[PDB]
């Protein structure tokens, strides 16, 4: 389909406790002398 | 253990399970749910960082 025409919505969303979202636990030559 | 099993299992460790240890000992477990996990990976030598922060 073309879809001509589509609106934005710019918020201050994503807000959280810098934590992952996710239930499990966020993850993570040499010298030598002559 | 429990990264282990849970490698057995195919899982990776909730923060839920970290919960049952919520932060425990001395450090904080929690951390291990921190988003920035991978970047703070590279912060090494940031206790003596800290220490040193005084003559800045």
């Given at each position: 389909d073309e879809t001509y025409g589509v609106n934005v919505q710019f918020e201050s969303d994503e807000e959280e406790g810098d934590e992952d979202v996710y239930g499990e636990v966020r993850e993570e030559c040499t010298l030598s002398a002559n | 253990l429990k990264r282990q099993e849970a490698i057995a299992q195919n899982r990776r460790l909730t923060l839920e399970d970290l919960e049952d240890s919520?932060?425990?000992?001395?450090?904080?477990?929690?951390?291990?749910?921190?988003?920035d996990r991978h970047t703070l990976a590279?912060?090494?030598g940031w206790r003596v960082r800290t220490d040193f922060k005084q003559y800045q």
């Open positions: - | 919520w932060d425990r000992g001395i450090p904080r477990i929690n951390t291990l749910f921190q988003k590279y912060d090494k």
